[PDB]
Amino acid sequence: AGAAPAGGEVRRVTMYAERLAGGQMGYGLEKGKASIPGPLIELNEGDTLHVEFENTMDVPVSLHVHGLDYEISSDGTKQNKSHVEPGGTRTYTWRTHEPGRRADGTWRAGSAGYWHYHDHVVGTEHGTGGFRNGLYGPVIVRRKGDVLPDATHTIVFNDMTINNRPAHTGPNFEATVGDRVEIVMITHGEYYHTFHMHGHRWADNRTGMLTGPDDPSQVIDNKICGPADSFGFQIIAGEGVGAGAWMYHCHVQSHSDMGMVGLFLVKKPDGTIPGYDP
Amino acid sequence: AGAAPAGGEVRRVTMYAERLAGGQMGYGLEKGKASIPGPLIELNEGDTLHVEFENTMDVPVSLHVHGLDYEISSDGTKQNKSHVEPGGTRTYTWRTHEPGRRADGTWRAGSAGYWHYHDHVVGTEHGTGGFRNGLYGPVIVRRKGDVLPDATHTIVFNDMTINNRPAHTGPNFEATVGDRVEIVMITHGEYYHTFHMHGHRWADNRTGMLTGPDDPSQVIDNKICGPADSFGFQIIAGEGVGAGAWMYHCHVQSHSDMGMVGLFLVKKPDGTIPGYDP
Amino acid sequence: GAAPAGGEVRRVTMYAERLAGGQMGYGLEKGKASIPGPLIELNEGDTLHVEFENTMDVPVSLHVHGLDYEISSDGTKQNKSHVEPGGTRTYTWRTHEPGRRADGTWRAGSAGYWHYHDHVVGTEHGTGGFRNGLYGPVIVRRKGDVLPDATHTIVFNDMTINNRPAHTGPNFEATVGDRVEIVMITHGEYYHTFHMHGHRWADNRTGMLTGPDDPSQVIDNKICGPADSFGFQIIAGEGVGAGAWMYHCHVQSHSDMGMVGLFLVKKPDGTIPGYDP
Ligand SMILES: [Cu+2]
Ligand SMILES: [Cu+2]
Ligand SMILES: [Cu+2]
Ligand SMILES: [Cu+2]
Ligand SMILES: [Cu+2]
Ligand SMILES: [Cu+2]
Ligand SMILES: [Cu+2]
Ligand SMILES: [Cu+2]
Ligand SMILES: [Cu+2]
Ligand SMILES: [Cu+2]
Ligand SMILES: [Cu+2]
Ligand SMILES: [Cu+2]
């Protein structure tokens, strides 16, 4: 699989917050193309990204990012007056840095991680109304040398939903046996959850893959997550287990009973899924 | 005594689902010997376990595992038609694999860990009723040269009970000062908990033990866990602290007040527990 | 600086005292009780004898996490190691360095971010002690650990921070570049997720990566439950500059209801751009 290059590029993007169907709100890279979750932002460690942000709505909104570097003027908080007025525009700047050695001899960790952005002013001073409506999205920051996936999928547990979807509507995600699939798992809102995958597992470290044979990270298929937690991993689809409709769910019993469920549809090369009704 | 060997043996076992008193249900290795939690299944990485499984109950049941490799047909789900009908039989196969380097140069995570099995059919299409009833049990998969303990105890925080026991009935576990004790700690149901042990601590990694002086893992005595979380560790009973009645409990305050307490009884070599006057 | 090897025997005096409005707290000097309790810092190898006085009219105890204590310093009713009202008792905490056992395994040492609390007030799990403020931090350093310019303790106790009224911080200030140690402890009934704008840390013992081979997750958001304890050291304003950097629980209803504070990081000229209450 491909390998992430060393960062250092200054990139520039427009992003738009727009109302969607049913009182929903989302970000998009171009006007009329807001989505929930918002578009995935992929950065190589050392990149800078300038986000020419526009709020097309009738209420204040913001863009705030976890993990990445930002001056206070890019917080996306009302307390700092770095939110965006109705119809307004503002340029947010996120930077990243590589790991390295400080002067005090100590080690400065790098920006690599599975991170996210969201709104910080819709509803409350903490964006409670924004998460509900869907103002959240993933950011991946890659380290030089990181393995690249064949497909990246974001699953957000926002209160009692997956991706603001109604219960028992997924979403489902498709791969072929052997595909290197990347999952981005963010939790928002009020409730704790446990993310669980049938038939697959990952390491509980930065990349979800053991570094080598001296990596002591626990290997799990089940992880407790809370509001604003984010992690990610990469799995070889159906490795050791074969093709099939592999179920993923929250393992909080009433949460999986009420529809916090989806399917990881792993197809054989020819396209059919063993033991599945399409 | 000693260390885990290399794996790869094909094993077979018989397993039954039976009713127990009080509307409870359990797994056992022989009829009339079901237990809550179910029997401890131990495997070495590479072993294959065929579970000749009989449902001696009048309602459907299934057998589902975390962490191990299994195909779709051994899912143990109503979904891909692998539950066991009342009075029916099924052979579930579980497989494990050693760590290795993939063709693409990535490091494939092995099966070794503290895992668990449970039903996916009683009550709801998830394990809900089965969990409340007691249909759950531990699986340990050891890697070559993992340190082997003198005794293994399973503690399941299932909803607001420890192993479906009444409030304030533990259970209690005995060891002698110096014993190498292994704890398997599983959680199920609806609530998060925080498992805590008095006078002992473990490392937050696969084994619960620091590999050596370069393992950076947290050293902890308190750990948040949610439904279907599982971890385990080994400790030396009494090490640096001496014999006595060492409390373990969930540390959610109302949880310990309403039953979620037990005792780790560490005896002196003469068998007495100092200061423990029941 | 860096922490030295341990070995020393330490003696300290502690009091459980009542506070205004039905609160309780621990103090090192009599009449100086506080919530959170005083910071206790040890080096691996050290022993601490805490001569302890209950200045109150109901029983109290002193229980610790992570450290080594024999049963007689358990601080529980079960082991009859609580302190009578008006009474005194010496609790002994021991620590140890890591080393290799006779059986060749590696014994993990005592170093870490730990805490002490009450275990008898209200119930035999100190539910009433936690409600009133009887908890505090304990830090145990490994030899060679990097020492901060400052340490601040943040206890999520139910839906309060350090038993404070909602929306009352606390705030903590530093100057850009300073080495700031946060101790973070949760108690009560609720899970929380502790988060900091502008800063991140490693999920390991020290909070910092040991080097380029450390695979720990680097995070700015950490779920935690009652009696969870952890710590980290950040460089104030590193890569992001001065400002009023919020920290808050991220469970949405807990941030909205007051579980919010400021990490006030100033420029060397003392200014904090954009900050105004
Ligand atoms: Cu859930
Ligand atoms: Cu499963
Ligand atoms: Cu399942
Ligand atoms: Cu946030
Ligand atoms: Cu509990
Ligand atoms: Cu304790
Ligand atoms: Cu499960
Ligand atoms: Cu306790
Ligand atoms: Cu909270
Ligand atoms: Cu934030
Ligand atoms: Cu925030
Ligand atoms: Cu405690």
Side-chain angles (χ1 to χ4, degrees):
Chain A
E9 298 261 290
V10 176
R11 310 222 160 270
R12 302 196 98 279
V13 78
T14 60
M15 189 179 308
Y16 303 94
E18 290 175 307
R19 287 188 176 280
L20 300 147
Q24 290 196 145
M25 309 178 159
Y27 303 100
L29 293 190
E30 201 62 271
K31 218 192 296 276
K33 288 175 181 277
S35 73
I36 302 156
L40 171 57
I41 277 62
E42 308 183 64
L43 305 173
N44 295 313
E45 254 175 347
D47 286 1
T48 298
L49 177 69
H50 303 300
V51 178
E52 283 175 43
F53 190 86
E54 184 177 329
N55 170 18
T56 73
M57 310 184 302
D58 54 9
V59 301
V61 76
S62 81
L63 180 66
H64 160 85
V65 71
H66 288 227
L68 278 66
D69 298 324
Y70 54 96
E71 300 203 89
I72 194 67
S73 65
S74 274
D75 206 12
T77 56
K78 189 163 169 203
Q79 169 209 251
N80 174 245
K81 317 302 179 87
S82 68
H83 62 310
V84 179
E85 79 272 17
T89 59
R90 188 204 184 81
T91 280
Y92 297 108
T93 292
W94 312 333
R95 289 161 298 104
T96 59
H97 60 281
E98 296 171 297
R101 200 153 213 89
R102 297 183 183 104
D104 49 15
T106 66
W107 189 260
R108 177 185 185 192
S111 305
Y114 292 100
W115 303 105
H116 52 100
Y117 56 98
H118 62 74
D119 159 68
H120 217 297
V121 305
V122 181
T124 64
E125 276 183 273
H126 295 83
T128 297
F131 295 109
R132 169 72 63 98
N133 299 343
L135 291 171
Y136 56 77
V139 192
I140 297 165
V141 184
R142 302 211 192 270
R143 182 157 291 154
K144 161 165 37 64
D146 276 353
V147 191
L148 290 165
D150 301 309
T152 300
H153 303 298
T154 325
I155 293 171
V156 188
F157 287 4
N158 180 30
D159 277 328
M160 290 307 225
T161 81
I162 315 170
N163 294 5
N164 288 17
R165 300 184 79 97
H168 302 103
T169 72
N172 297 346
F173 295 101
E174 270 172 26
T176 305
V177 183
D179 279 357
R180 174 166 282 279
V181 184
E182 190 174 47
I183 304 294
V184 180
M185 213 280 121
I186 313 155
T187 302
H188 284 316
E190 187 69 19
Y191 310 121
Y192 90 85
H193 306 285
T194 48
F195 174 79
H196 170 60
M197 276 205 65
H198 280 214
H200 312 79
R201 69 215 63 72
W202 63 100
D204 208 27
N205 59 11
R206 170 181 69 93
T207 65
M209 321 174 268
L210 291 178
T211 59
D214 50 338
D215 186 352
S217 315
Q218 202 191 336
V219 177
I220 59 177
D221 71 6
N222 200 98
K223 177 157 175 62
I224 199 192
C225 37
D229 275 344
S230 64
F231 66 98
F233 54 92
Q234 294 180 13
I235 51 179
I236 303 298
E239 193 171 43
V241 298
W246 296 101
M247 176 170 32
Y248 77 91
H249 53 101
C250 184
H251 219 303
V252 180
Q253 287 305 129
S254 42
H255 297 192
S256 58
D257 283 343
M258 291 183 349
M260 284 199 65
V261 172
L263 291 175
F264 187 37
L265 299 157
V266 182
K267 311 160 286 186
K268 266 285 122 189
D270 67 337
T272 72
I273 296 137
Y276 184 58
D277 58 323
Chain B
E9 305 309 305
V10 176
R11 311 180 187 284
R12 263 177 173 98
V13 75
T14 172
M15 183 162 297
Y16 309 88
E18 331 190 291
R19 296 196 160 279
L20 307 180
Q24 295 215 99
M25 308 171 172
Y27 302 103
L29 306 173
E30 315 154 67
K31 323 170 72 134
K33 296 174 87 177
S35 59
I36 307 163
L40 171 64
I41 290 188
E42 180 180 322
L43 299 180
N44 300 306
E45 283 185 314
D47 285 346
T48 300
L49 189 61
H50 304 276
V51 180
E52 172 153 86
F53 181 93
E54 175 173 334
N55 174 10
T56 80
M57 299 187 303
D58 52 323
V59 299
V61 81
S62 98
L63 179 67
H64 169 81
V65 68
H66 289 227
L68 316 193
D69 302 306
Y70 52 90
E71 298 190 307
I72 284 288
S73 40
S74 294
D75 215 27
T77 58
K78 210 145 209 326
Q79 281 81 341
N80 38 52
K81 304 173 63 232
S82 39
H83 61 277
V84 192
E85 273 303 286
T89 187
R90 214 178 166 103
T91 292
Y92 295 95
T93 292
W94 301 341
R95 298 176 272 103
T96 62
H97 65 267
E98 304 162 62
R101 187 74 63 178
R102 288 186 190 94
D104 68 353
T106 58
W107 192 254
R108 181 192 186 188
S111 300
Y114 291 101
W115 305 106
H116 61 100
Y117 59 87
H118 67 86
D119 159 72
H120 219 284
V121 153
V122 173
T124 67
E125 312 226 7
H126 297 263
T128 301
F131 280 124
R132 292 187 194 157
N133 288 3
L135 280 168
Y136 57 74
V139 182
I140 297 179
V141 181
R142 315 210 188 269
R143 166 164 312 148
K144 47 90 176 174
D146 282 356
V147 190
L148 301 170
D150 291 323
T152 306
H153 313 296
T154 301
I155 299 177
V156 192
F157 284 2
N158 183 24
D159 281 340
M160 307 287 306
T161 77
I162 301 177
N163 297 346
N164 290 36
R165 307 262 297 228
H168 303 105
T169 72
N172 291 352
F173 304 107
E174 311 189 350
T176 300
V177 181
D179 280 6
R180 170 166 287 278
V181 184
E182 176 178 64
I183 303 310
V184 182
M185 197 294 134
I186 301 164
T187 300
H188 281 304
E190 154 80 10
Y191 313 111
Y192 84 97
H193 313 267
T194 50
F195 173 79
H196 173 58
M197 298 187 69
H198 283 210
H200 297 76
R201 61 227 70 93
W202 68 97
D204 203 6
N205 64 14
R206 175 173 71 93
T207 62
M209 307 168 268
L210 288 182
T211 48
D214 283 316
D215 191 339
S217 311
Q218 305 184 78
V219 158
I220 78 177
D221 72 9
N222 203 90
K223 179 166 173 60
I224 195 171
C225 36
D229 277 336
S230 41
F231 68 97
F233 53 86
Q234 298 185 6
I235 57 190
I236 307 306
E239 194 182 46
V241 305
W246 292 106
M247 221 175 310
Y248 76 90
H249 60 86
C250 171
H251 217 305
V252 178
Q253 284 309 135
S254 86
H255 286 199
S256 52
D257 301 332
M258 268 171 316
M260 285 193 61
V261 192
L263 286 190
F264 180 40
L265 302 176
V266 185
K267 311 174 267 201
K268 301 178 88 188
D270 64 9
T272 64
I273 309 126
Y276 176 65
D277 307 314
Chain C
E8 282 194 25
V9 184
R10 258 87 149 250
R11 274 177 196 281
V12 80
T13 48
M14 195 173 287
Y15 318 86
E17 303 179 319
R18 284 197 177 265
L19 305 169
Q23 296 230 83
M24 301 166 183
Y26 298 111
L28 285 200
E29 316 160 46
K30 208 191 307 150
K32 298 306 281 185
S34 70
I35 305 170
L39 172 61
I40 289 179
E41 170 267 323
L42 287 164
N43 304 317
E44 287 180 313
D46 295 339
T47 298
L48 184 62
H49 304 303
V50 189
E51 30 195 354
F52 180 88
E53 213 205 294
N54 175 4
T55 77
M56 319 188 296
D57 44 34
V58 313
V60 78
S61 71
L62 175 62
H63 170 81
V64 82
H65 283 236
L67 307 202
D68 302 333
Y69 48 98
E70 288 164 8
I71 220 73
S72 56
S73 289
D74 200 19
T76 59
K77 284 197 50 182
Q78 293 75 1
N79 282 317
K80 260 80 207 178
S81 47
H82 55 314
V83 179
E84 92 188 45
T88 307
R89 179 183 198 117
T90 291
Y91 291 105
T92 291
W93 301 350
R94 282 181 283 98
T95 60
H96 73 268
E97 318 176 351
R100 200 157 293 284
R101 289 198 194 87
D103 67 72
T105 42
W106 188 253
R107 183 193 184 184
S110 309
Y113 293 94
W114 304 106
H115 56 106
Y116 59 92
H117 64 76
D118 162 75
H119 213 301
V120 306
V121 166
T123 62
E124 292 188 59
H125 295 82
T127 304
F130 292 116
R131 290 187 70 70
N132 306 355
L134 292 167
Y135 52 77
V138 190
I139 303 192
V140 177
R141 314 220 185 251
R142 194 147 289 153
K143 169 205 172 179
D145 281 354
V146 191
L147 287 167
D149 300 308
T151 308
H152 323 297
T153 296
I154 299 165
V155 189
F156 283 6
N157 183 19
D158 280 317
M159 299 179 305
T160 88
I161 310 173
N162 293 353
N163 283 41
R164 295 169 67 100
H167 305 278
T168 57
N171 299 336
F172 312 100
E173 31 182 310
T175 302
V176 168
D178 292 357
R179 178 160 284 263
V180 163
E181 193 169 49
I182 289 308
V183 184
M184 203 278 155
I185 302 168
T186 294
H187 287 298
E189 311 269 24
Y190 304 76
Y191 86 93
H192 302 264
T193 59
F194 164 81
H195 171 59
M196 271 189 78
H197 296 201
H199 302 74
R200 64 220 62 74
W201 66 94
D203 203 15
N204 53 10
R205 160 180 78 83
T206 81
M208 284 158 303
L209 300 185
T210 63
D213 298 303
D214 183 346
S216 325
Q217 312 155 339
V218 168
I219 57 168
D220 68 2
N221 192 93
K222 194 173 150 63
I223 198 186
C224 51
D228 272 343
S229 58
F230 70 94
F232 58 95
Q233 285 177 23
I234 52 187
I235 298 315
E238 187 181 53
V240 296
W245 294 107
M246 301 181 58
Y247 75 90
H248 58 92
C249 179
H250 218 308
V251 173
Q252 294 296 140
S253 87
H254 300 181
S255 57
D256 294 347
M257 290 195 256
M259 293 199 58
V260 175
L262 293 187
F263 184 41
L264 299 178
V265 178
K266 320 171 270 213
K267 296 175 85 169
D269 75 333
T271 55
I272 307 166
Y275 179 38
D276 190 283

